[PDB]
Chain A
Amino acid sequence: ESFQFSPSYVDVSSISNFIIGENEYHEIQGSIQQVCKDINRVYLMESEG
Chain B
Amino acid sequence: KSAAQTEIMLTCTDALNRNYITIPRGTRFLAYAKDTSVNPYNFVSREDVIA
Contact = CB atoms under 8 A, between A and B. Distances in A.
Interface of A: 8-9, 13-14, 17
A8 B9 CA distance: 9
Nearest to A9: B9
Interface of B: 9, 50-51
A14 B51 CA distance: 6
Contacts of B50: 17
6 contacts: A8-B9, A9-B9, A13-B51, A14-B51, A17-B50, A17-B51
Contacts of A9: 9
Contacts of B9: 8-9
A29 to B, nearest CB: 33
